[PDB]
């Protein structure tokens, strides 16, 4: 089904004689989220971009300084597989039957990742509420890791990564990752979103943290430096 | 349209493909995924040797030994690709078509592999001709901007007898660009517009050198189009009546 | 003789006539060139509007790999130049259009206009048809000097393209309109030419024209598709 | 003994009622590495700084991204401590003895950090003996770890960290790292160098990696990024 | 015959030939045009000197009043091409020189330089010829476009003359005819000036001449002349 999202960092590579072809290794994130969202017409999303798109948010908490974020949306789902373990799934993902998460049932992706404005982790919630602080990317019909064939090319890919710009520097922060869509106003389908961070994972207070919920990010953000205080007393 | 179809009928020297992807396709439960490139209109291969005491094309920054390419482009080219690897016993011979110094012809085999070689290094610089007849002269004259260096920038060939030191540069435009307000200001460091270009395959370490070495040149450009297609050549003179006799045909052509 | 070539701003070739006060020159011909027949016919519906009170025509070109250099041209009237040939674009307008109606004393004063879309991939051609315009390449008016002009005054268009960095021609989706001087109503035969400096026939490398954006479309996938399939 | 080096991250803070106090507790660095040395009138020193003035070697290997770098370089040892498990020891430093690394026997520290030009593991021993890049930093009198009163305050200490300039950004690449002095010339004492890196520590190919000698240096960073492909396949 | 009119770069007519690979086009000739045949002979010093080493050979305008466009051509050799008529400056160099030669295999690769001096005044002339340049406007190496050069390479020099100051008002001018290459050099050669600017009216009208004395002469006497019509 869904095929890995990896970082753009090469770790090997080799050229196949008599071929045009060299296959290369990646390496992968050290964190990977998926999420299995559906877009149905007159129901409200999460927010709107520049006033007329339907976008749906997933924050990322991050506690130091990362060198890459790859972000992915593909639309639909239906013919590429259902959510798995781990994976995070919307209610009107969970509400919609397998003939509406196929096509002909899809939309154009469209994503945009913004810097928000909390610098501590209970500030999260409070950031959330407020005004984006910096726009680091935009992209329309970036993806290459998904053969699609379904329909037209459409499907979403942006990695932001490293006088190089500001608007780059994964530093400490809290950002926000719109799902939404090329075209403005109503739109209908299935999409799965990608989430990946060149960082190792599992280190409380030190590793990114990711959520839809900016309330529950803030409270798994908090009792994670909570902890990491602890462990340095 | 032959030179887009694949073949090196192997014998050793990896392909010089362009940076223009066509395919991808990752291998599920794995780490790896398959790309297809665009292969380069025209690619050349030189063989060479450097032999203690004996002269150089020419020196670069005045103390590394130089061997020279001339490139001549008739008019603007997407993207060209430079390689040089040392040294060539273990990948190969050269082939047909292939241009070999006197130097290399006289090398033997065991000459011609470890532990005899040098950590190569690329340049290439924009001369001054932009008419046929005027690139004996300007191969004379002093260079006018410098595009790009590189030391140890390849990833083509798996290099295992020494330290990875091999020389790789693509010299291009943005494919695509970062935006669409990129392409107000291209670094000109890229537009290989009409002209005569000199590469000088060197070294990383100034002074006497020794052993054999294989440099690759790509042009993204259809071959074999007089007066339109690149012409590559070791001598200039040669270069020039070549390029000369191209346009002429060209102008027939046009009458 | 009929419609003089579209060539190229390359000189291959020059000498000077002794005792004369004349020069000839050679030029490089674009690789390929492609004329359009067209006819403005008042109370008939344009592609669309330019400053949005100018009537305009459009012709797509999808270029796969950067280009040295673009020649747009265009003359009103045509009558008594002559009729469209094989290979020629002609409009359902220009089709329907009496020798009368395409001669003079009907004509206007042409003007050209380039732009950059938002297409990067053939299969996005359609799609940035429909969108705005990223960039404007160039705007001409009177600057034709192919075509002796001697039934009226010389407000031919011609533009060039090219370099010596917005206007370099890399990888993309361009349309040019095919448009006029004076605002709103006029009435008259025009025939555009369009030439790039581009090898032709190359299936995924050389450059396409056409006045229909999905036909573009198709055609530039099917390309690629064949580019593809010989790469492999 | 020696005091720890921290990072400037401040993880807790609270004041102490009734008076001028406050106590603060820092985020450790990930990787504390201490080196004793030992300069010798007549002894050939790694290098010269400015063409004159004595200096010794750390390499530093940064395989990723680094919030933060802690230099820390303290003269005379003596009256401090001497060297335990796990810490650099130079030929010079175990040849002394005490009442060489002792007062009245020390020097006027002095620290400066440059990027090399290395930007893979197999170019380090490489980069080693080709000129510096770009200067990062430079610091005379800075130590406030170490309370000094055998002589003035003259040990060094610098913290480089995060449109931010790029002579801070410690991205991917060999770093060196020159302990000398603020006299030219011949200089005559025992002296402790510590090095701290905001980034946790023991993860192959991942964790930055710190040598007194280059080649060692890359040995050991071409083997970690050996293990990590080998893990990612 | 041979040497073929220098014409400004002005375009009056044009017309593009149906079917073929031209287009005519009518060029507007300057007001007054000199040519100026020379022979480099080695030994034989020149006017001056180019860079220290380039060998050079001098010709003056005196510009009374702004003009639009100045074009200067420089070719060798010139045995191929024609001798001298009626109206054209001689060197004594080439008066001296035979057929063989001012023909080929003896030529050279040209060089043009042009340069504002310092006089304001047909008086002063003469003083800012010995005094040193004012500003560069132009050099040019291997321009020329009007010759269809094919006894060799085409290294024939041909130049055409927040903003700039390649403006032609009021003053004098040194035209530097030289060779690309420093030291030695064997060749005849014909030298062209064209400026755009109706010819014979005294004190209005630009001069030329090879002498600045002479050129002196003959700027003051046409102001002088000029003066005496006005009053
Ligand atoms: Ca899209
Ligand atoms: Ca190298
Ligand atoms: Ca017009
Ligand atoms: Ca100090
Ligand atoms: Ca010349």
New interface residues.
Partial sequence: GL??L?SSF??????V????????????YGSVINYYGYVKPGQAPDGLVDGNKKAYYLYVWIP????EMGVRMISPTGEIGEPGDGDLVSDAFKAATPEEKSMPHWFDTWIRVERMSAIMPDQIAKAAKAKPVQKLDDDD?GD??Y?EERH???NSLTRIK???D?KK?L??GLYRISFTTYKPGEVKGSFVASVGL?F?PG?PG?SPLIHSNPEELQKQAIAA?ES??KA??
């Fill in positions: 095929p890995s990896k090469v770790l090997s590579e080799s050229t004689p008599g071929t045009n072809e060299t296959v290369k290794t990646f390496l992968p130091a300084v990362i060198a019909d290459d890791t053969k037209n090319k459409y490293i006088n190089i500001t520097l530093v400490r060149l190792p280190i030190v430096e990491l205080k340095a007393s």
